[PDB]
């Protein structure tokens, strides 16, 4: 006979979903500004339409996304192998190879073959092909069902070839599916360890050894992925809110008057711009107003130089004596003004140069000659009991705001600063006014030293541990607490600061007014420095490096306060115990989760329908009744549902039965399927308007065998509702096979196919003594036994033949002694072929690949390479018919036991 698939079909295998991921440069010389590049591509094996998308990028023209260009690829005859995405291991499924015939008026006769794969269990074995001949009408298709059972996990491959009779047209499709084990995906938490290197660990570092994945429900020989999640935990600290700029609108003052009155108007405008620049409240205040107040600050500095005396000092008039306070206060305002507007620096340093030559005794005392005509601007220094110490502190603070600007100009400035600091420490512990301890508490905390008792006296003079208060006008106490806030922000202490700022905000002092020069200037210089230097966070800076023995490198991540990599995941398919080294400041969380395949119940099949399929030979060659009963598993009746019926090979449904079924009230068989021919109709869909949840809805129709075949593949019935193909239920049917399943032998989720031959089919008369010795002395033949059949445990899945080992002719890899028992397994189709009788003796040999269980409970499989020969008894050899066999078997034993196998 002619096998038409002798066409040397190289099956189609390249079916990418996307390709042509290429980069081309249009270097060809342009014609009217358009370069044309010709590009030779090789189309893939898919029979579809490709959509090709180009995007160009040009230095002078930019980005351009082309319109999509389509390419349709087709043939007049081809296979479409409708493979699912995944199949569960050892679960029987029905795939569909759809064969298309787009000839106009030619009816094709095709020989189509499912190729054998050892990874699958089908009717195609190593010695038997699954070939069949089908008829395809023109401009039609035909679905060829194939029943397979995948036997090993991973990417496994299905190949179907076809070649047409009387035309030189052939095709083959070789696609692949994933074989997933019977379990369900599940995730478990391996470890949650909190990283804190300045609290855990030693010497600044924290090493955390992670155990590997502690799974005990895992399906054996399956992949697990461990996901390492390094994530920084941000922390925040409470900060007091800034003063609302709507309450500060009255501080924009046009400065006017003489040498003291000009500084009265200049003060609330310089300090408001300085506070609003630091808090950045100009958006909620008016951005246009910033430049107008900036010109008033320039107007203040311009008119103040008119009262700067030529001795680089400051007085109220040009004929007035100079002041120690007013010169120090112009130094205090002009130094804070440099950050926004500058003109001349020798005016600032010239006033500091006069402040030490004329008003610095070597005691370190600043003494006031008092030509300050306005006692309003003086603030708490007016009406002070220790007016000597409080003024030494005032001028010293003025020298430090101009120290960073006048370090090279006035080289004698650190001498007077040390002398002024020496006078403060001696009489610090003798003060009794809260204002003097506050202003000389900032004057000794600025770049200098306050002793342990001096810091203790500075903190214990705060009544209610939040405010500095003395008998007197409250603008002296608000000024004093503003000095004590700048002290606590100069010492970088922040445990005493929050009750101090809270009291300043609850005072609701917004500056401005009569006598408010010190109180407006200090309460917004101190609250600006609180917004300049503030703990918003706790400084997160973790350098966490992970040393994994799964690789040859250490992956690190600098988890700053920067929000670029707050969290970073590191996947590692290798399941090994690794080390997490974490050092630095701040806190962080580490999460390690491993996904895996958990062996649970394999009950995902038929979760929405019950389906019972029976095939009965009830009475043109063969005629059986196919009965399908189905029932929905819900609270209500299901909606429109689909019965995808597949015929067993060689069978076709009765056409008069389908026309009666289509006439039903809740059933629909389409006119397309009723008008089909009797042959080439191996699939059928009966549509159901409803299926009951209360009772089984049953239909039945006869099927006729129009073609006799040696091997009948089981048909299949599939039920699903229209809105969900995934919630389906498939039952197989086949006469002489249990529940329509192909013959397989399974143990602990490992099956092998049993569709092979029953045993070695060589006749007992065509075999000689030399033929028995040549076959049994092969190295593949592991065991050679003389057995005695004790019991035959009949079952529906497979027959078990318990053999007593009568003689160990050749001992294999199974240490079995004489008298012991081993079970020989064969499928139920071989029960009539083997013809094994109890208490009879047999010569048996086979391969070591036919072993089954573990070594304590080792079973043998009677496969295609297993020799089973009847051994007649000693009295039975007296017949002339058994003389040839008994002479061979007795010689076969003496040749193997006494002399063994050479080579």
């Amino acid at each position: 006979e002619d096998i038409i698939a002798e066409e040397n079909i190289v099956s189609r295998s390249e079916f990418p979903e996307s390709w042509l991921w290429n980069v081309e440069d249009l270097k060809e010389p342009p014609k009217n500004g358009i370069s044309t590049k010709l590009m030779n591509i090789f189309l893939k094996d898919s029979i579809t339409t490709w959509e090709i998308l180009a995007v160009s990028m040009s230095d002078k023209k930019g980005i351009c996304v082309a319109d999509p260009f389509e390419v349709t690829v087709m043939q007049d005859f081809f296979i479409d192998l409708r493979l699912p995405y995944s199949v569960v291991r050892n679960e029987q499924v029905e795939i569909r190879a759809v064969l298309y015939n787009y000839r106009q008026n030619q009816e094709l006769k095709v020989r189509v073959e499912l190729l054998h794969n050892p990874a699958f269990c089908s009717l195609a074995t190593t010695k038997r092909r699954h070939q069949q001949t089908v008829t395809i009408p023109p401009k039609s298709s035909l679905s060829v069902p194939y029943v397979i059972v995948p036997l090993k996990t991973g990417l496994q491959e299905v190949e179907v070839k076809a070649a047409v009779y009387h035309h030189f047209i052939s095709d083959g499709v070789r696609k692949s599916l994933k074989v997933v084990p019977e379990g369900i995906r599940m995730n478990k938490t391996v470890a949650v360890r909190t990283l804190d290197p300045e609290r855990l660990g030693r010497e600044g570092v924290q090493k955390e050894d992670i155990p590997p994945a502690d799974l005990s429900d895992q399906v054996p020989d399956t992949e697990s992925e461990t996901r390492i999640l390094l994530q920084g935990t941000p922390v925040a600290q409470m900060t007091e809110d800034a003063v609302d700029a709507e309450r500060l609108k009255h501080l924009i003052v046009t400065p006017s008057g003489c040498g003291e009155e000009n500084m009265i108007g200049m003060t609330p405008t310089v300090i408001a711009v300085h506070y609003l620049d630091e808090t950045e409240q100009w958006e909620k205040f008016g951005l246009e107003k910033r430049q107008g107040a900036l010109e008033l600050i320039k107007k203040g500095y311009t008119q103040q130089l008119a009262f700067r005396q030529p001795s680089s000092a400051f007085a109220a008039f040009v004929k007035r004596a100079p002041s120690t306070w007013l010169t120090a206060y112009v130094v205090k305002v002009f130094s804070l003004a440099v950050n926004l507007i500058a003109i001349d620096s020798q005016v600032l340093c010239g006033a500091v140069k006069w402040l030490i030559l004329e008003k610095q005794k070597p005691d370190g005392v600043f003494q006031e000659d008092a030509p300050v005509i306005h006692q309003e601007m003086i603030g708490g220094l007016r009406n002070n009991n220790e007016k000597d110490m409080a003024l030494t502190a005032f001028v010293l603070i003025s020298l430090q705001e101009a120290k960073d600007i006048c370090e090279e100009q006035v080289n004698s400035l650190p001498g007077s600063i040390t002398k002024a600091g020496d006078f403060l420490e001696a009489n610090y512990m003798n003060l009794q006014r809260s204002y003097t301890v506050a202003i000389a508490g900032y004057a000794l905390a600025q770049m200098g030293r306050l002793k342990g008792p001096l810091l203790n006296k500075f903190l214990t003079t705060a009544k209610d541990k939040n405010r500095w208060e003395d008998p007197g006008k409250q603008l002296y106490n608000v000024e004093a607490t503003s000095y004590a806030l700048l002290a606590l922000l100069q010492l970088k202490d922040f445990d005493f600061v929050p009750p101090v700022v809270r009291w300043l905000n609850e005072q609701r002092y917004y500056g401005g007014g009569y006598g408010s020069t010190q109180a407006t200037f200090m309460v917004f210089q101190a609250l600006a420095q609180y917004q300049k230097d503030a703990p918003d966070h706790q400084e997160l800076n973790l350098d966490v490096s992970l040393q994994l023995p799964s690789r040859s490198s250490k992956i690190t991540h600098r988890i700053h306060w920067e929000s670029a990599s707050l969290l970073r995941s590191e996947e590692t398919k290798e399941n090994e115990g690794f080390t997490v080294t974490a050092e630095g400041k701040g806190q962080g969380t580490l999460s390690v989760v491993t996904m895996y395949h958990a062996k649970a119940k394999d009950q995902l099949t038929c979760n929405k329908f019950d389906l019972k399929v029976t095939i009965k030979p009830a009475p043109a060659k063969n005629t059986m009744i196919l009965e399908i009963c189905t029932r929905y598993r819900g609270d209500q009746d299901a909606t429109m549902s689909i019965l995808d019926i597949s015929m067993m090979t060689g069978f076709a449904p009765d056409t008069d039965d389908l026309k009666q079924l289509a006439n039903g009230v809740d059933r629909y068989i389409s006119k397309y399927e009723l008008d089909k021919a009797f042959s080439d109709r191996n699939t059928l869909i009966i549509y159901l308007d409803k299926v009951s949840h209360s009772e089984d809805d049953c239909l039945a129709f006869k099927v006729h065998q129009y073609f006799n075949v040696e091997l009948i593949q089981p048909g299949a019935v599939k039920v699903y509702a229209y809105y969900n193909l995934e919630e389906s239920c498939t039952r197989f049917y086949h006469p002489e096979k249990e529940d329509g399943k192909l013959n397989k032998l399974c143990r602990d989720e490992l099956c092998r196919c049993a569709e092979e031959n029953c045993f070695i089919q060589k006749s007992d008369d065509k075999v000689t003594l030399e033929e028995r010795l040549d076959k049994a002395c092969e190295p593949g033949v592991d065991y050679v036994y003389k057995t005695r059949l004790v019991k035959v445990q009949l079952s529906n899945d497979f027959d078990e033949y318990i053999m007593a080992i009568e003689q160990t002719i050749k001992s294999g890899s199974d240490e079995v002694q004489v008298g012991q028992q081993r079970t020989f397994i064969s499928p139920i189709k071989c029960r009539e072929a083997l013809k094994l009788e109890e208490k009879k003796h047999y010569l048996m040999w086979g391969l070591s690949s036919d072993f089954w269980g573990e070594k304590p409970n080792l079973s043998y499989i009677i496969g295609k390479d297993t020799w089973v020969e009847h051994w007649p008894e000693e009295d039975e050899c007296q017949d002339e018919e058994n003389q040839k066999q008994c002479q061979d078997l007795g010689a076969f034993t003496e040749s193997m036991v006494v002399f063994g196998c050479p080579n």
Partner: nanobody
Amino acid sequence: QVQLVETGGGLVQAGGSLRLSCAASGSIFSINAMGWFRQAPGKEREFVATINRSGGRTYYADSVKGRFTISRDNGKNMVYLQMHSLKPEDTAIYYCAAGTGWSPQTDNEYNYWGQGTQVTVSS
């Protein structure tokens, strides 16, 4: 496209033999049908022999059924027609033709034909 050139023809005796070689322009691979056709003087163009794409399937006309043998070399882009046990009724112009594979025993599915060669078998 692709065109063909026929060689190997000439004058031969009645009982002798000769083989005709067909040269292809492009690569003859992936072309399913490769056929030989002949046209006797006074007669119509009739079918002689087709070969498979791989060479494993052939078809012959009943007049030349056990006498001719068609072969091809897909690596050399060549088709051959070995003509044995000649008859005087075989005198014809022999055409080599490229086909699609559909209905390979008829000329209706051959779109690329050759020049032809004269094979005279005198009595």
